[PDB]
């Protein structure tokens, strides 16, 4: 997260850290008791390594009783996701067992009604992604409140040049943005999960390159199927 601040610990009990070989790789969001939603490209980046999901965390390094590292039973990437595209960049991860719910661990209701978030709406993104271009990895959860950017502006040639489909949304990036390591994390608008931070080779904090989020509502039937 660029241009944010340290989040209040455990104020986002849905926040997951998708790890590979005990190291944070991507953000994630607890959507059901045994299901964590993330981004398809994270599974590619994980490859060989042991994929685990850390719930109830604030600090990645400091131990706490709320912190629980789960093994992944099954990794379900969206069937239409490709490594050379940003389309259908969703991934559902089944935990080894149902997560122990409490003040620090709770699933987040995700948007079911396929209607765009209005442009200018302030949404919250959180993550353990880089906080500087130098590649600094924060130990503690960061967050930032970003205004949603309309799709037509986002598709200007200067920006994403038509790659933003109806199944995607954008947010402002100028000096405030989601970055490398924030992919797979949540974009929450008025208490509702609306988007998942999309993977890609996008530079962060640049006004010419708005942040990209896959709209969860667009994949409602695919999420329902895997979660049952």
């Amino acid at each position, epitope marked *: 997260i660029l241009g944010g601040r340290e989040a209040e610990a455990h104020a986002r009990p849905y926040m997951a850290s998708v790890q590979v070989n005990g190291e944070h790789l991507c953000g994630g969001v607890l959507v059901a008791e045994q299901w964590v939603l993330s981004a398809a490209h994270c599974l590619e980046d994980a490859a060989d390594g042991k994929v685990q999901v850390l719930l109830g965390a604030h600090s990645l390094s400091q131990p706490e009783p709320s912190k629980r590292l789960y093994d992944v039973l099954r990794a379900v990437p969206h069937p239409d996701s490709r490594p050379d595209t940003i389309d259908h960049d969703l991934l559902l991860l089944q935990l080894s067992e149902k997560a122990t719910l409490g003040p620090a661990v709770r699933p987040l209701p995700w948007q079911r009604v396929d209607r765009d978030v209005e442009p200018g709406t302030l949404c919250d993104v959180a993550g353990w992604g880089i906080v500087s271009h130098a590649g600094r990895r924060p130990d503690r959860l960061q967050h930032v409140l970003l205004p949603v950017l309309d799709r037509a502006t986002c*598709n200007r040639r200067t920006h994403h040049d*038509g790659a933003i489909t109806q199944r995607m949304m954008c947010a402002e990036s100028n000096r405030r943005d989601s970055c490398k390591g924030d992919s797979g994390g949540p974009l929450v608008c008025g208490g509702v999960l609306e988007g998942v931070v999309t993977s890609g080779s996008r530079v962060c904090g640049n006004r010419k390159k708005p942040g990209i989020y896959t709209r969860v509502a667009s994949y409602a039937a695919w999420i329902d199927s895997v979660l049952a």
Partner: antibody
Amino acid sequence: EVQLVQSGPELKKPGASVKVSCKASGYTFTNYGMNWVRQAPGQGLEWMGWINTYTGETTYADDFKGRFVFSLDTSVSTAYLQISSLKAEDTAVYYCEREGGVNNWGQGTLVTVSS
Amino acid sequence: DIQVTQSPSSLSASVGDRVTITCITSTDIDDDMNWYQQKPGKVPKLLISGGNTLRPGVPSRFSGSGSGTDFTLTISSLQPEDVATYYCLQSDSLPYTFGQGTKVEIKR
């Protein structure tokens, strides 16, 4: 396939107004904004401005601030250019160009201003 | 608000010659330069877009170069069908800006 079909040639007297249309098809109209470009006879391309098809916001180039207004009709996926207080110098081909993706232009509309 | 100076105004070159056209911007625009071709009696066609990206289906003899304020369009081996007026367009921010154009003619 993407298409942008503009309205036919116009003849207008000085002082009058004209409204040129640009009908889009083969893509989600509100996903891409629209630029308006002018070409006076035997002259170069002039970027007039942009209209955001999603929000309705408009940006005009300095030379096109005043008598030029962009508008929409999202239900028929159409963008309009209205020119007021027509001058003989407004005699030009006006194009619409879809902003972003595979580059698409309308065929142009020639507007002649004469008594 | 951003200004653009295109040169030359016109040129004549033979089939197989290399044609080079310049566009200089008033301010730094990173790589947000586009190049259009407009053949006589035709609609403008985008050949090159930001980052000197050659648009699919456009012959490889067309290439763009430059970043910042100084941009160049090169036609490496001028063909009879390349006869047209070429226009650069900066797309750093709104409003976009076309150059004055360069009329390319064939010397035969």
